[PDB]
Design an enzyme around this catalytic site. Structure first.
Site, PDB file in Angstrom:
ATOM      1  N   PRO A 103       0.830  -1.219   0.000  1.00  0.00           N
ATOM      2  CA  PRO A 103       0.000   0.000   0.000  1.00  0.00           C
ATOM      3  C   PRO A 103       0.856   1.257   0.000  1.00  0.00           C
ATOM      4  O   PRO A 103       2.075   1.200   0.177  1.00  0.00           O
ATOM      5  CB  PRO A 103      -0.868  -0.028   1.247  1.00  0.00           C
ATOM      6  CG  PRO A 103      -0.108  -0.984   2.151  1.00  0.00           C
ATOM      7  CD  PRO A 103       0.635  -1.974   1.252  1.00  0.00           C
ATOM      8  N   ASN A 148      -7.798   7.899   6.401  1.00  0.00           N
ATOM      9  CA  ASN A 148      -8.687   7.617   5.273  1.00  0.00           C
ATOM     10  C   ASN A 148      -8.194   6.401   4.498  1.00  0.00           C
ATOM     11  O   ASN A 148      -7.053   6.367   4.032  1.00  0.00           O
ATOM     12  CB  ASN A 148      -8.764   8.820   4.332  1.00  0.00           C
ATOM     13  CG  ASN A 148      -9.473  10.009   4.960  1.00  0.00           C
ATOM     14  OD1 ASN A 148     -10.448   9.847   5.690  1.00  0.00           O
ATOM     15  ND2 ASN A 148      -8.980  11.208   4.679  1.00  0.00           N
TER      16      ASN A 148
HETATM   17  N1  LIG Z   1      -1.614  -3.964  -3.788  1.00  0.00           N
HETATM   18  S1  LIG Z   1      -0.525  -3.039  -3.008  1.00  0.00           S
HETATM   19  O1  LIG Z   1       0.859  -3.568  -3.243  1.00  0.00           O
HETATM   20  O2  LIG Z   1      -0.821  -3.042  -1.537  1.00  0.00           O
HETATM   21  C1  LIG Z   1      -0.608  -1.398  -3.604  1.00  0.00           C
HETATM   22  N2  LIG Z   1      -1.704  -0.643  -3.629  1.00  0.00           N
HETATM   23  C2  LIG Z   1      -1.538   0.613  -4.051  1.00  0.00           C
HETATM   24  C3  LIG Z   1      -2.509   1.608  -4.150  1.00  0.00           C
HETATM   25  C4  LIG Z   1      -2.187   2.886  -4.592  1.00  0.00           C
HETATM   26  C5  LIG Z   1      -0.875   3.188  -4.946  1.00  0.00           C
HETATM   27  O3  LIG Z   1      -0.560   4.435  -5.391  1.00  0.00           O
HETATM   28  C6  LIG Z   1       0.108   2.208  -4.853  1.00  0.00           C
HETATM   29  C7  LIG Z   1      -0.226   0.932  -4.408  1.00  0.00           C
HETATM   30  S2  LIG Z   1       0.722  -0.475  -4.160  1.00  0.00           S
HETATM   31  N1  LIG Z   2     -19.132  12.416   9.947  1.00  0.00           N
HETATM   32  S1  LIG Z   2     -17.967  13.530  10.184  1.00  0.00           S
HETATM   33  O1  LIG Z   2     -17.888  13.897  11.637  1.00  0.00           O
HETATM   34  O2  LIG Z   2     -18.274  14.758   9.378  1.00  0.00           O
HETATM   35  C1  LIG Z   2     -16.423  12.884   9.674  1.00  0.00           C
HETATM   36  N2  LIG Z   2     -16.155  12.403   8.462  1.00  0.00           N
HETATM   37  C2  LIG Z   2     -14.888  12.037   8.247  1.00  0.00           C
HETATM   38  C3  LIG Z   2     -14.340  11.538   7.068  1.00  0.00           C
HETATM   39  C4  LIG Z   2     -12.986  11.226   6.976  1.00  0.00           C
HETATM   40  C5  LIG Z   2     -12.158  11.414   8.077  1.00  0.00           C
HETATM   41  O3  LIG Z   2     -10.832  11.123   7.988  1.00  0.00           O
HETATM   42  C6  LIG Z   2     -12.689  11.908   9.265  1.00  0.00           C
HETATM   43  C7  LIG Z   2     -14.044  12.217   9.345  1.00  0.00           C
HETATM   44  S2  LIG Z   2     -14.993  12.867  10.615  1.00  0.00           S
END
Ligand SMILES: NS(=O)(=O)c1nc2ccc(O)cc2s1
Ligand SMILES: NS(=O)(=O)c1nc2ccc(O)cc2s1
Ligand SMILES: NS(=O)(=O)c1nc2ccc(O)cc2s1
Lengths: 116, 115, 114
Positions: free
Chosen positions: A1, A97
């Site tokens: 990732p 996120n």
């Molecule tokens: N399948 S994995 O090796 O965990 C990966 N996922 C992402 C997703 C976005 C990205 O920019 C790069 C990668 S590598």
């Molecule tokens: N329902 S809310 O209080 O407005 C929220 N949404 C997010 C989404 C992403 C995130 O990283 C954090 C939060 S708090």
């Protein structure tokens, strides 16, 4: 990732070995070779959480698959644990996120991961 | 929600209390407790909008729900308003990416919002 | 489109003209007027790719449409080409996240594109 951490913790407080630890723990957590893992840490940021400028972190984790309910909770426990231990950031001042990317929407090495 | 602003405006031009004002206005705009709101401003960035380096901003707003056609238009009016008034950035040089997040894809406090 | 490049390459290594070249090539690749295109380059970053701190880049490209299998492969070839030539970053140390944005989820000029 790919994992990104943005934080108001000072650069001086980021320990030697932090990127390498993130790389290894992410490889272990996802069952993937470390050659795939990208990590990015951005200290000294102007940010607030709950209206307070105490230590906090805003993070992103992108992966082609390996994203889901139980898996994400596990990533959160792992990553909040590391941020608490290494950067002394309280887990309740961390947002992460999670993005489940399609292979066709991830570029690498002049192409993408959709070769079919 | 989580709101991020990236801008080429100098750090000194970001007024004291800007993060607090963003937190307050977003809370009010979304009808949510400020304790949930995270804000992040990144000045002094190397960026261009339309090929020009006059003041601009690239932003994102993440929320679990409360994202949609009419709501996003209201958020845009609010946020462009604040950026124009406080950072002197013209609204036609602001982009805001809106994301409707699933609770299971948002981590917090060692877990996610999917319990 | 909106295109963001984060890299551990030093600020001094970003050539004069880089943002403008990105702007023009992105206009050409998407057929969008350059007036629409936003570009953002973030040097001197603390990052690792495959556990190494050799030059690398993490990027994102957002667009309302113009995102897809063949198009994304074309953008990757174009952008990795520029990063290799201009920033001396090896293409196999670049990741780019592509996002196809709904017009209702993109704000601009006090409103959205819906
Ligand atoms: N399948 S994995 O090796 O965990 C990966 N996922 C992402 C997703 C976005 C990205 O920019 C790069 C990668 S590598
Ligand atoms: N329902 S809310 O209080 O407005 C929220 N949404 C997010 C989404 C992403 C995130 O990283 C954090 C939060 S708090
Ligand atoms: N149709 S287009 O000119 O290529 C654009 N798409 C986006 C998407 C997000 C965003 O924040 C800005 C833009 S401009």
């Amino acid at each position: 990732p790919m994992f990104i951490v943005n934080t108001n913790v000072p650069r001086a407080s980021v320990p030697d070995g932090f990127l390498s630890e993130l790389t290894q723990q992410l490889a272990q957590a996802t069952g993937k070779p470390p050659q795939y893992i990208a990590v990015h840490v951005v200290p000294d940021q102007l940010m607030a959480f709950g209206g307070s400028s105490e230590p906090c972190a805003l993070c992103s984790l992108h992966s082609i698959g390996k994203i889901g309910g139980a898996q994400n909770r596990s990533y959160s426990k792992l990553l909040c644990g590391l941020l608490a231990e290494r950067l002394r950031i309280s887990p309740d001042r961390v947002y992460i996120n999670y993005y489940d990317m399609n292979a066709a929407n991830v570029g690498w090495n002049n192409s993408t991961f959709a070769l079919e």
